[PDB]
Amino acid sequence: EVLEFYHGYHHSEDEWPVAKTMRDLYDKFAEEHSGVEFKPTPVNGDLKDIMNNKVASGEFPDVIDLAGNAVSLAAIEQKLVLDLKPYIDSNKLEKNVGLNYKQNQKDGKIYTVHEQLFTMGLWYNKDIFAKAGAKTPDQWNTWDDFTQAMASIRKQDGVYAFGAGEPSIRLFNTVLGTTENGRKLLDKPLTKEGIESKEFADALKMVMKEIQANGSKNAGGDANAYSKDFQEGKSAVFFNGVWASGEMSKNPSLAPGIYPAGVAISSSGGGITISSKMSEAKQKLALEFLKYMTSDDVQKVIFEKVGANPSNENVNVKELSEKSSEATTKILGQAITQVKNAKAVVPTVSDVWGGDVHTAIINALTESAAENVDVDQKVKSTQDVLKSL
Numbered sequence: 001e002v003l004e005f006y007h008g009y010h011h012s013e014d015e016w017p018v019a020k021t022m023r024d025l026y027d028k029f030a031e032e033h034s035g036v037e038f039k040p041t042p043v044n045g046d047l048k049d050i051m052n053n054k055v056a057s058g059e060f061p062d063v064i065d066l067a068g069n070a071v072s073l074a075a076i077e078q079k080l081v082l083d084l085k086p087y088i089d090s091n092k093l094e095k096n097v098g099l100n101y102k103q104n105q106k107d108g109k110i111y112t113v114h115e116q117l118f119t120m121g122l123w124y125n126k127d128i129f130a131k132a133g134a135k136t137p138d139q140w141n142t143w144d145d146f147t148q149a150m151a152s153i154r155k156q157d158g159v160y161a162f163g164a165g166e167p168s169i170r171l172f173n174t175v176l177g178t179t180e181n182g183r184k185l186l187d188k189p190l191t192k193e194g195i196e197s198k199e200f201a202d203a204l205k206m207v208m209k210e211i212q213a214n215g216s217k218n219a220g221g222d223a224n225a226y227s228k229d230f231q232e233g234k235s236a237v238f239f240n241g242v243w244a245s246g247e248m249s250k251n252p253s254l255a256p257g258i259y260p261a262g263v264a265i266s267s268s269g270g271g272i273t274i275s276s277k278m279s280e281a282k283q284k285l286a287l288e289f290l291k292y293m294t295s296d297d298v299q300k301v302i303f304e305k306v307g308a309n310p311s312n313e314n315v316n317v318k319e320l321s322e323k324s325s326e327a328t329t330k331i332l333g334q335a336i337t338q339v340k341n342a343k344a345v346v347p348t349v350s351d352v353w354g355g356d357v358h359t360a361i362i363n364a365l366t367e368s369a370a371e372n373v374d375v376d377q378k379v380k381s382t383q384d385v386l387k388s389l
C-alpha cells in the first residue's frame with residue numbers, strides 16, 4: 001500500500017532552501033516507516049486543483065498539505081475528509097496543534113491542521129519611508145495615516161507603494177477588523193446581511209480607492225511575484241506573513257510592522273488534510289504523519305530552519321529568538337511578537353468564509369485597480385457577486 005502525500009514544496013534549494021528542508025522532513029518520515037509506504041509528491045502549480053479535481057468524482061487525495069488554503073466545503077459535505085479531533089484528543093496533542101485546535105474547529109470537528117501558523121503582519125522598507133518623510137507602520141493609528149504615507153511615497157519616483165492582487169485582501173481583512181461589527185463578521189460564515197452591512201461596504205470601498213490610487217500597473221500578481229521587487233527596494237510595503245523572514249533578512253532595510261489601528265492577521269490556515277476513504281493501516285499512518293509534523297523536534301526545525309511560526313506551543317519562539325545568532329530568526333521573532341501584541345487580531349477571510357469568497361474578493365479588488373472603474377458601483381457589483389455564491 002502507498003500513502004500519497006501532496007505538498008507545494010517543489011523549489012530547488014537555490015530558489016527556496018525552505019522547500020528542501022521540508023522535503024527532508026517528509027522522506028525522513030518515510031524511512032522511519034511497515035506495510036504502507038509514505039510517498040511525498042511535490043506539486044508544481046495549484047494545490048487546490050489536486051484537491052478539487054478529486055472532490056469532483058467523490059474522492060480526496062490521501063494526504064494533502066494545503067499550505068494555508070481552505071478545505072473544500074463540498075469535501076466536508078460529502079465527508080471526503082477525516083475528522084482529526086478525536087485522534088488529537090486522545091493522543092494529547094492540543095498543545096501540538098495550537099491555534100488549529102480552536103480555530104479549525106467546525107461544529108466540534110477538525111478537518112485540517114497547519115503545522116505553520118498563518119501569522120501575518122506586513123513588511124516595509126525603512127529607507128524609502130524615511131526618504132519620503134512617511135509615517136512608519138507603528139505610527140498608522142488610522143486608515144488615513146496609511147493612505148497619506150502611501151501618497152508621500154508615490155511622490156518619489158523609482159518606487160511603487162505596494163503590490164496589489166492577492167496582497168490587497170490583507171488590507172480588506174484588517175480594515176474590517178477596525179470595528180467591533182467588522183470583527184464579529186469574521187467570527188462566522190458570511191451572510192447576505194453581512195455583505196451589506198455598512199462596515200463590509202466601507203472596507204471594500206476604502207481598499208479599492210487605495211488600490212486604484214496605487215496604479216493599475218501594480219495589481220498584476222500574487223505575493224510571490226512582489227517579493228523580489230521588495231527585496232530589491234522597488235516597493236515600500238509588502239503584505240506577507242512572518243514566514244517571509246528568510247527572504248527578508250537578506251536586506252536589512254526592511255522591517256516587520258502591522259496594519260492600521262494596530263490590527264494583525266492571526267489564523268491557522270488549512271494544512272495537513274486526510275482522506276476518509278482509506279484502509280485502516282494507511283489512515284493510521286496518515287495520522288502518525290500529522291503527529292510527526294506537529295511533534296516537538298520537527299516544530300523546532302519549523303522555527304529555526306524553516307523561518308516560520310510553529311503550531312506547537314511547546315516551542316519557545318522568544319527564547320529561541322533570544323539565543324539565536326541568525327538574522328532570520330531575529331526578525332522572525334520580532335514579526336511574531338508584533339502580531340501577538342496587536343490591539344486586535346483577525347482570522348483570514350479564507351479560513352472563516354472559505355476559498356471561494358477569498359478568490360472572489362481578490363478578483364474584485366484586482367479589477368478595481370483599472371483606472372476607468374467607478375469605485376461606488378464596483379463595490380455594489382462586488383457585493384452582488386458575493387451574495388450569489
Ligand SMILES: CC(=O)N[C@H]1[C@@H](O[C@H]2[C@@H](O)[C@@H](CO)O[C@@H](O)[C@@H]2O[C@@H]2O[C@@H](C)[C@@H](O)[C@@H](O)[C@@H]2O)O[C@H](CO)[C@H](O)[C@@H]1O
Pocket residue numbers: 007008009010067068069070116117118166222223224240241243244269308309350
Ligand atoms: C492560502 C494563502 O494565502 N497562501 C499564501 C501563503 O502561503 C504560505 C503560508 O501558508 C506559510 C505559513 O508559514 O507556509 C508557506 O508554505 C506558504 O507558502 C505557499 O505554500 C507552499 C507549500 C509553497 O508552495 C510556497 O511556494 C507557497 O507560497 O503565502 C505565500 C507567499 O509567501 C502565498 O501568498 C500563498 O498564496
